[PDB]
Every structure is written in C-alpha cells, then in structure tokens.
Amino acid sequence: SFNLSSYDVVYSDHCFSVNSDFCPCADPSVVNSCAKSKPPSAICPAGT
Amino acid sequence: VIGDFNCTNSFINDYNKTIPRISEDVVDVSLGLGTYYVLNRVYLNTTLL
Numbered sequence A: 001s002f003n004l005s006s007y008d009v010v011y012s013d014h015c016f017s018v019n020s021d022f023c024p025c026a027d028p029s030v031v032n033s034c035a036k037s038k039p040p041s042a043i044c045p046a047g048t
Numbered sequence B: 001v002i003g004d005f006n007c008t009n010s011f012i013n014d015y016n017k018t019i020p021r022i023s024e025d026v027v028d029v030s031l032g033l034g035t036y037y038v039l040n041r042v043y044l045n046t047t048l049l
C-alpha cells in the first residue's frame, strides 16, 4: 500500500506495458563476470 | 505452463510432435456462418452493408 497522509491522492506519470512472460530476475548463472557490475539475482517461477 | 501452481506432479512426458490438424476447408460465410443479428432490429427482406 502507498503509505501516505489521510488526504493524499496518488497519480501516475509514466505507465509502462510489458508482456506476460517477464520479471526482473537474473539467471542464477551470474556468480561472477569480468565487468564487476553484477546485479542481484533471484529465481523466478516457471512460465517467464 | 499456464499457471504458477502445482496441481499434480505425476504422469509428465518429455517431448512429442503434437501437429495441429489444420482444416483444409477455408472459412465459408456464404451460408451465414460467422455473422450475428443486429441489436434490437429486424431488417426484414432486404440487403444491408
């Protein structure tokens, strides 16, 4: 929930669409690379 | 994979062909197939676009 005050109204600015099979989940084969800019990884459920 | 839940975890195969039996007959609408009636209208004995 958007924790705000008792009289606050939330409005969106940029709405982005994406396909069904999508999640910000890196493949578990990102243990180490040569760029030293490894993002955090997490296992995503099947179907994406 | 349709959903994100496990209904049953038994009797799962590996691979197959599963060729869809596409019909050789094209969509024929000359008899009225694929059309519906206009909402709250009759249009008795006439042709309309």
Ligand SMILES: *[C@@H]1O[C@H](CO)[C@@H](O[C@@H]2O[C@H](CO)[C@@H](O[C@@H]3O[C@H](CO)[C@@H](O)[C@H](O)[C@@H]3O)[C@H](O)[C@H]2NC(C)=O)[C@H](O)[C@H]1NC(C)=O
Binding pocket: A045, B004, B005
């Ligand atoms: C809405 O859908 C999600 C996704 O299907 C449901 O989350 C799933 O809930 C089931 C049942 O609690 C989880 O199964 C359990 O997993 C634990 C390990 O975390 C395992 O020890 C148990 O034996 C059981 O198998 C499943 O993991 C979980 N999946 C995810 C991705 O969170 C959720 O419960 C559904 N909510 C409602 C209200 O139906």
